[PDB]
Amino acid sequence: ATVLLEVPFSARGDRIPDAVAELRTREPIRKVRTITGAEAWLVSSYALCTQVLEDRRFSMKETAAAGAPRLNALTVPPEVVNNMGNIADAGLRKAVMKAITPKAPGLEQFLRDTANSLLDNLITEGAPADLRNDFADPLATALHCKVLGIPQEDGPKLFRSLSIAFMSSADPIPAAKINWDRDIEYMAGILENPNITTGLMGELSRLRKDPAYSHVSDELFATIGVTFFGAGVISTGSFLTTALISLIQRPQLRNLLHEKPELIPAGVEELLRINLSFADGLPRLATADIQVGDVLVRKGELVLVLLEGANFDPEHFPNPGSIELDRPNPTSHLAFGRGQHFCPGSALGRRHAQIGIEALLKKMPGVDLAVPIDQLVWRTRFQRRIPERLPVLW
Numbered sequence: 001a002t003v004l005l006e007v008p009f010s011a012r013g014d015r016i017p018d019a020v021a022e023l024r025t026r027e028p029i030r031k032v033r034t035i036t037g038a039e040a041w042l043v044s045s046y047a048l049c050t051q052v053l054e055d056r057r058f059s060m061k062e063t064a065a066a067g068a069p070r071l072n073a074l075t076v077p078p079e080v081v082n083n084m085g086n087i088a089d090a091g092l093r094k095a096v097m098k099a100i101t102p103k104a105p106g107l108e109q110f111l112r113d114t115a116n117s118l119l120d121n122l123i124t125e126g127a128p129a130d131l132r133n134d135f136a137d138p139l140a141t142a143l144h145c146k147v148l149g150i151p152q153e154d155g156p157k158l159f160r161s162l163s164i165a166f167m168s169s170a171d172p173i174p175a176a177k178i179n180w181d182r183d184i185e186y187m188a189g190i191l192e193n194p195n196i197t198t199g200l201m202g203e204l205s206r207l208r209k210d211p212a213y214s215h216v217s218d219e220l221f222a223t224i225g226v227t228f229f230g231a232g233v234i235s236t237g238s239f240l241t242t243a244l245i246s247l248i249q250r251p252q253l254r255n256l257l258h259e260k261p262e263l264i265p266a267g268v269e270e271l272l273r274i275n276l277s278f279a280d281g282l283p284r285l286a287t288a289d290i291q292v293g294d295v296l297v298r299k300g301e302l303v304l305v306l307l308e309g310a311n312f313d314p315e316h317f318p319n320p321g322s323i324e325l326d327r328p329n330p331t332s333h334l335a336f337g338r339g340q341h342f343c344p345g346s347a348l349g350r351r352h353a354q355i356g357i358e359a360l361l362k363k364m365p366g367v368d369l370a371v372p373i374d375q376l377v378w379r380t381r382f383q384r385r386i387p388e389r390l391p392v393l394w
Ligand code: HEM
Pocket: 060, 084, 085, 100, 227, 228, 229, 231, 232, 233, 235, 236, 239, 277, 282, 283, 334, 335, 336, 337, 338, 340, 341, 342, 343, 344, 345, 346, 348, 349, 350
C-alpha cells in the first residue's frame, strides 16, 4: 500500500518533474495531501486551471477560515488573505495599482543604473559571483524601495524578513509574527514621516490625510506597504533568479538576446511561461459543489492550481519545454495568475526582469554556471523555489 500523493512534488526550480505531464494526462484534477495533512484537489491542465481561477466560487478569502483544510499555515493575520479586497473596499485600488507600474519618470533608468552598478561590483570582485544574493535580490529590493518611496538603506532589513515570511510551513511560525509586527511598526512610521512624499507610501500618506479616506484604518495603510514590498521583492527576486538559470542553460538563446536585445521582452515572456518559482499550487476554497473535469468538488474543499501544470500543457503551448519567441499566444500563460486575483505587479515584474537581463547580457555576455547544475541547493518548505546561491563565471 502507498499513501496519498503528497504535494509539493519537488523543490527543484531548474526542471519540471516528468510526473507533472503524466498527472496532467491521466488525472488533471486529483486528490493529494498537503504538508499540513489536509486533502486537496491538485489541478494541472490549462483548461481546468483557468476554470478554477475564473470562477470566484473557488474563493481566496475563504482559505483563511478557521477549520478549513490548509495548504500551509498562515504567516500573516487572516485579514491579509483578503488584502486586495480590503484595498478595493477602502477605495484605494486604482491608486495602489498606479503607484506600482513601472511608468514613473526615472524608474526604468534607476533600475538600469542599479543593475549596472551591481554588475560592475561583481566584475571588480572577480568570478565567481552569486547572481541571487548579489544581483537579483538586491535589484528587487532596490526597485521596491524606490517604488514604495522609502529609503534604500531600509531595504536590507525588510528583505531579511522574507526567508521566514514566505515559508510554506505545516505549523505557525513564531518568528513570522515578530518580523510582521516590526515591519508594520516601520511602515506606520513611514506614514508619519514628512520626508516620505514619493512612490506608493508617499501617495498613501497623502490619501490618509484626505477627508475621503478618513475612516480607512492606519492598520490597512501600513499593511499595504508591508505586503506589497514583501510580495514584490520575493516574487521578482525569485523569478529573475530562476529565469537566469534557464537563460544560462541556453547559450544559443543567451547569444540571440545579447545580439538582438529588442527580443528580450519576448524572451522574458517565455521565461515567465516556463518559470517554476511558485512552489505550491495557488489555493482556493470551494464555496459550492462545482464540477471540475471528472470530479465534483464539494463545498469546503481545498483546490490547488498548479501554475506549471497549465503553463507546460502541450495542448495550449506546443513543445512546452522549449523557449519559442514566436508563439501566437505568448502572454496567455498563468505566471501572474488569472481572474479576480491576477497579479497587480505584472508590468513591474516584467520590467524588472527585462532590465536585469539586458544589463547582465551586456556586462557578462559569457555568463555561465560556475558549478554543475546539480550542486545548486534548492530551498525547501518555502512559497518559492530558489537556489540558495547561484554561482556564475563570465
Ligand atoms: C515576476 C514577478 C511576479 C510574479 C511571477 C507574480 C505572481 C503572482 C501570482 C501568480 C499571483 C496570483 C495569486 C493568486 O491568484 O492566488 C500574484 C498576486 C499578487 N501579486 Fe504578484 N507576482 C510578481 C510580481 C509582483 C510584484 C512586483 C508585486 C507588487 C509590487 C506583486 C504583488 C502581488 C499582489 C499584491 C498579489 C495579490 C493579488 C490578489 O490577491 O488579488 N507581484 N502574483
